[PDB]
Write an enzyme that holds these catalytic residues in place. Structure first.
Site, PDB file in Angstrom:
ATOM      1  N   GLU A  11      32.710  44.900  50.364  1.00  0.00           N
ATOM      2  CA  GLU A  11      31.660  46.202  50.274  1.00  0.00           C
ATOM      3  C   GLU A  11      31.040  46.316  51.451  1.00  0.00           C
ATOM      4  O   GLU A  11      30.460  47.256  52.078  1.00  0.00           O
ATOM      5  CB  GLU A  11      30.850  46.185  49.147  1.00  0.00           C
ATOM      6  CG  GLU A  11      31.585  46.186  47.825  1.00  0.00           C
ATOM      7  CD  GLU A  11      32.051  47.659  47.413  1.00  0.00           C
ATOM      8  OE1 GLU A  11      32.851  47.951  46.769  1.00  0.00           O
ATOM      9  OE2 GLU A  11      32.004  48.568  48.307  1.00  0.00           O
ATOM     10  N   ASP A  20      30.765  56.387  51.457  1.00  0.00           N
ATOM     11  CA  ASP A  20      31.662  55.603  51.076  1.00  0.00           C
ATOM     12  C   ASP A  20      33.076  56.085  51.444  1.00  0.00           C
ATOM     13  O   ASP A  20      33.176  57.175  52.066  1.00  0.00           O
ATOM     14  CB  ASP A  20      31.745  55.026  49.777  1.00  0.00           C
ATOM     15  CG  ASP A  20      31.947  56.063  48.716  1.00  0.00           C
ATOM     16  OD1 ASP A  20      31.627  55.873  47.594  1.00  0.00           O
ATOM     17  OD2 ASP A  20      32.305  57.012  49.197  1.00  0.00           O
ATOM     18  N   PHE A 104      33.897  46.980  39.685  1.00  0.00           N
ATOM     19  CA  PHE A 104      32.693  47.176  40.614  1.00  0.00           C
ATOM     20  C   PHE A 104      33.168  48.311  41.467  1.00  0.00           C
ATOM     21  O   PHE A 104      32.405  49.510  41.659  1.00  0.00           O
ATOM     22  CB  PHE A 104      32.331  46.023  41.654  1.00  0.00           C
ATOM     23  CG  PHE A 104      31.142  46.250  42.524  1.00  0.00           C
ATOM     24  CD1 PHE A 104      31.103  47.062  43.353  1.00  0.00           C
ATOM     25  CD2 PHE A 104      30.006  45.723  41.984  1.00  0.00           C
ATOM     26  CE1 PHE A 104      30.044  47.109  44.373  1.00  0.00           C
ATOM     27  CE2 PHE A 104      28.776  45.730  42.783  1.00  0.00           C
ATOM     28  CZ  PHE A 104      28.824  46.521  44.097  1.00  0.00           C
TER      29      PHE A 104
END
Length: 162
Positions: A11, A20, A104
């Site tokens: 990440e 993102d 996640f």
């Protein structure tokens, strides 16, 4: 290697609001703020998440706090989901981390939808599961990360993260 280090690798860390891979406002260690096109909406979510008026910037400590909560939330999501929990329970610790990583990134419901991949993982047909997992929007949009996660399922090692 552990799930926190794994997800830090996947990440990254940015202390200012950014977008993102999907164009969604995000901060810290892959903390999704909102899918709304509105930066103002994102800033409001951030302030609510942190508990102060941030104007889009947080500290490393604050980022790590959201991250701890998000990893906790991913595990909690798995254990509370009737499709994910049996698969998780059936896995070794390394492959458990791979499943947490997927949840996640895409959320409980998303991963729970991978019905055929989940069955292959449960059956421990690792090469077959790996082939099935790559037949996905997930793999096509983030292929290098997906490759690391899939290799982790295939091998039960951390080889893709060293």
């Amino acid at each position: 290697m552990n799930i926190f280090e794994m997800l830090r690798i996947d990440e990254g860390l940015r202390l200012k609001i950014f977008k993102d891979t999907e164009g969604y406002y995000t901060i810290g260690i892959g903390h999704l703020l909102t899918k709304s096109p509105s930066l103002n909406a994102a800033k409001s979510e951030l302030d609510k998440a942190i508990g102060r008026n941030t104007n889009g910037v947080i500290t490393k400590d604050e980022a790590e706090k959201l991250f701890n909560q998000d990893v906790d939330a991913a595990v909690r999501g798995i254990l509370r989901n009737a499709k994910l929990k049996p698969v998780y329970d059936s896995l070794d610790a390394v492959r458990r981390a791979a499943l947490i990583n997927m949840v996640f990134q895409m959320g409980e419901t998303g991963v729970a939808g991978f019905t055929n991949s989940l069955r292959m993982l449960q059956q421990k047909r690792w090469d077959e599961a790996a082939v099935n997992l790559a037949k996905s929007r997930w793999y096509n949009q983030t292929p290098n990360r997906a490759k690391r996660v899939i290799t982790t399922f295939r091998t039960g090692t951390w080889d893709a993260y060293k």
